[PDB]
Design a protein around this ligand. Structure first.
Ligand SMILES: *[C@](C)(O)CCC[N+](C)(C)C
Ligand SMILES: *[C@](C)(O)CCC[N+](C)(C)C
Lengths: 540, 540
């Protein structure tokens, strides 16, 4: 019992907490420091390892959320506020959490590291939908989740500078992975079987960790849910990163007056500003009106990413690696209520032809009028070119395919055709608790509560079928973590999940019904985005 | 009886012939001269009306075919030689034929004028598949068919010249229509109910007669089968026409030596050459390797066509006109054995990816590498990008849509949306007698034998179902000629044929089964050709 709630790691000692699930207790260690607080002169810099302490650190409650913008588009609405911070905001925020089974496993157990999404500008490991108590109890594995800096504090980059090098939010994630290497065995975890998994910007982070040598030696399998490192939103160039960082400094009064504008004094002035001041101007440095675009994201600096994610995927060897990838049915609907004209979460969003054509300029920013014309051609139903419900679904497919589905299929194809064993899925169940409107289908990010077993929580009004569905999905993810193969290593009756190959392009659909194999991750639509559109942009 | 085999028209007297069909005799007048022979100094010039004669002209057999190239791609093969000339070749060839019922109708009967196709380079009114004896006997109407000059003799144009103005093959057709106005009443025909119908280049001719004022006063309804005046092959510009005419003169030794090259002496030298000499070099003036392209076709001269067919369709009023238009299921397969690499009528033509990409350059000549890339994107099955049978069908759709199906749908839409009542069909029956291979489906031009009632010929091995099918199709065409409405004016049980509108885009499919209404003349594919591709070519 309480003998297992006190663990000694290399920094010192910790007191854990025992959480209860309907089928047994778990041991949790919430709020372990893994880095020095990145405040004062440490803002925008890479993290430093946490110095050893004396006494015991209390690891019984989640620590503070990293400073981030707070969504206020629909105040009081469950759909948006379920992702909003549930702890006080502070720059002192680099803490990680470990869930471990009770009684503690006697032999090394596979470790899953969760990396949250939120467009690299928001999110926290302390959210209720990321509670690792159900997954660890049912599948008897070790779950780790960390906080990493987001927004300007994580990804403001002045390239070439030493004061604001950029990507330090990814460096926070890497330090946590070194920490799991050096300490997970104390909780019963195998440091030789580590599986990263993330969603949205978490999946792009997992992807970028695949393409940088220093991080690859810290894990062994990868799960990318609804995101990829080569997505048009997950990366920015050195020239644009400099422009957004400088525009931000200008908006907050740096350089004052008055004085020259070198990088050292720009960051020195940015470091004297209160954290909330930088946050209130973060959306004001975007170049266009757009959905699915965020200000401060990973930069191609030549260090963490020696080349663009596209180049690094094409010129890489991935033998001996297993990857699980997939999308939900309606990847694009979620973002349309964030800017697309005619869209509102409180009505049918039956848009007109004129609003559809305007929405295309928002959903596909930074492209020529001719390029937009190609998008309108491919995504119009010329038998019903003005049907509002069809144009609604079309724009959702425009945003979905351009930002998630096609970037993912591109990554999955090349990974399989270059040594990696890849499994692909499509999440097609819509939760009965979903507070978003019906026309959004299954939106971006609403598979997570089923991967984490949230339906097992008795205080939630899920259905009996959805509880069995959750337990099935948890086994898939756990099995992939133990064996690298989502299929149960011996049972044959349940339908099997074939790998994804560049030729057959096979994937399964996850819903209340048994597994069904399909072919093609929107192959027709994705050929436009992955093949034809790049050439259409090179030729003026 | 034989009292009705002698008719007096405004030129003189004629002796006809009585032909037998399984259900009654018909009266035919084959070989009536309607113009002076365009020989010697009359070559390349517009036709002159036939001067009155004395005695009686024998109108009992077909006259001579206009000089034309003779297909020799498959000597001895029924599929090709059924379209080859079946009478002696001569420049003395401007003759027309009238079929009329027996006994002669007592009240004015609607008149159908047939205009044959053959890429404006071949064809004759004397072909067996254009025999008007079955259609006139069963539906008791008047059928007229003429010969018009083809190839250089009909369409060699030096624009601005008076010696070779061009389009005189169309002027031969117009003179025949004036003739039907001035003489059809002598055979029992109503000069106030004239219906043009043609196929391939015959349908483009019917279309161009709709867009030129002097010819519109000569007919009242139009049927366009597998062709349109705005097709990329049916028209050439003044600059290109001059180049092809001059290249032809060069190949036959004009100007000799030696002397300057003005238009008057070029045509004067072209007129001293034997007809067979000009024919043997006709294909040698084409600019590229291509299918569905022909050397000497109608020219935009500003006279017969004041503007391009595209401009004239867009800026025209078509109220009070009824049009019947349609295509066969596989418009493109026929031409692939004329140049597309990998294609042969004697094997399965299972082409490779490399041959498909080369075939696209042949089937869509004169377009940029980027434009071809768009065609490959839209017509590739990215789930089976190297399936030979799928690429075979894809290339047939490339040629079919680009040259026939999309040019037709473009014309039908604007006609309906500008006053004309339009009916649309798709011919989907493959004759049991078809000697072409199976993979060609139903090819270009193999609805004609069913419109003319050829299956009723007892010496042919057609099936009993196909005989009923022919009689049904003949009623459709006849009903449209009498009433302007293909549906039977009173019977309701048989399914009805709704008009074609730009919005609903409704059409019927013609085969052994009852009428079935469908929507969309390849709307998705045709939006690429009619909307997006033009813009892709303007932008370099
Ligand atoms: C992705 C860009 O990180 C989007 C994440 C959105 N939520 C709702 C999943 C946080
Ligand atoms: C059209 C271009 O005239 C093609 C006609 C081909 N035949 C086989 C119908 C003559």
């Amino acid at each position: 019992e309480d003998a297992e709630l006190l663990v000694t790691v290399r920094g010192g000692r910790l007191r854990g907490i025992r959480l209860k699930t309907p089928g047994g207790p778990v041991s949790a260690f919430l709020g372990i420091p893994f880095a020095e607080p990145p405040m004062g002169p440490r803002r925008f810099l890479p993290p430093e390892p946490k110095q050893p302490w004396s006494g015991v650190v209390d690891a019984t409650t989640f620590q503070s959320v990293c400073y981030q913008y707070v969504d206020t588009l629909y105040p009081g609405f469950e759909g948006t506020e379920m992702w909003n911070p549930n702890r006080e905001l502070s720059e002192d925020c680099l803490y990680l959490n470990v869930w471990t089974p009770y009684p503690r496993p006697t032999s090394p157990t596979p470790v899953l590291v969760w990396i949250y999404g939120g467009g690299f500008y928001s999110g926290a490991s302390s959210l209720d939908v990321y509670d690792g108590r159900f997954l660890v109890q049912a599948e008897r594995t070790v779950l780790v989740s960390m906080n990493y800096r987001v927004g300007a504090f994580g990804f403001l980059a002045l390239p070439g500078s030493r004061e604001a090098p950029g990507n330090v939010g990814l460096l926070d994630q890497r330090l946590a992975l070194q920490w799991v290497q050096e300490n997970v065995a104390a909780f019963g975890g195998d440091p030789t079987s580590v599986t990263l998994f993330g969603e949205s910007a978490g999946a792009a982070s997992v992807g970028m960790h695949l393409l940088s040598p220093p991080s690859r030696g810290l894990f062994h399998r990868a799960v990318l849910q609804s995101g990829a490192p080569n997505g048009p939103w997950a990366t920015v160039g050195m020239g644009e990163a400099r422009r957004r960082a400088t525009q931000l400094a200008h908006l907050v009064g740096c350089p004052p007056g008055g004085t020259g504008g070198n990088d050292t004094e720009l960051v020195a002035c940015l470091r004297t500003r209160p954290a909330q001041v930088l946050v209130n101007h973060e959306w004001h440095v975007l170049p266009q009106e757009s959905v699915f675009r965020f200000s401060f994201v990973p930069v191609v600096d030549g260090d963490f990413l020696s080349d663009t994610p596209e180049a690094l995927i094409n010129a890489g060897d991935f033998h001996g690696l297993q990857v699980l990838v997939g999308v939900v049915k309606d990847e694009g609907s979620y973002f349309l209520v964030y800017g697309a004209p005619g869209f509102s979460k409180d009505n049918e969003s039956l848009i007109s032809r004129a609003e559809f054509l305007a929405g295309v300029r928002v959903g596909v920013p930074q492209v020529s009028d001719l390029a937009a014309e190609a998008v309108v051609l491919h995504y119009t139903d010329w038998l019903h070119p003005e049907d509002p419900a069809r144009l609604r679904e079309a724009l959702s497919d425009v945003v979905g395919d351009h930002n998630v589905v096609c970037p993912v299929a591109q990554l999955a194809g090349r990974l399989a055709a270059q040594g990696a064993r890849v499994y692909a899925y499509v999440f097609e169940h819509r939760a009965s608790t979903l507070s978003w409107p019906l026309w959004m289908g299954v939106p971006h990010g609403y598979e997570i509560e089923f991967i984490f077993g949230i339906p097992l929580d008795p205080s939630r009004n899920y259905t009996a079928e959805e509880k069995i569905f959750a337990q099935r999905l948890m086994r898939y993810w756990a099995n992939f973590a133990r064996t690298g193969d989502p299929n149960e290593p011996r049972d044959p009756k349940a339908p099997q999940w074939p790998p994804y190959t560049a030729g057959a392009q096979q994937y399964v659909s996850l819903d209340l019904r048994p597994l069904e194999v399909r072919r093609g991750l929107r192959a027709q639509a994705c050929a436009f985005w992955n093949r034809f559109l790049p050439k259409l942009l090179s030729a003026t």
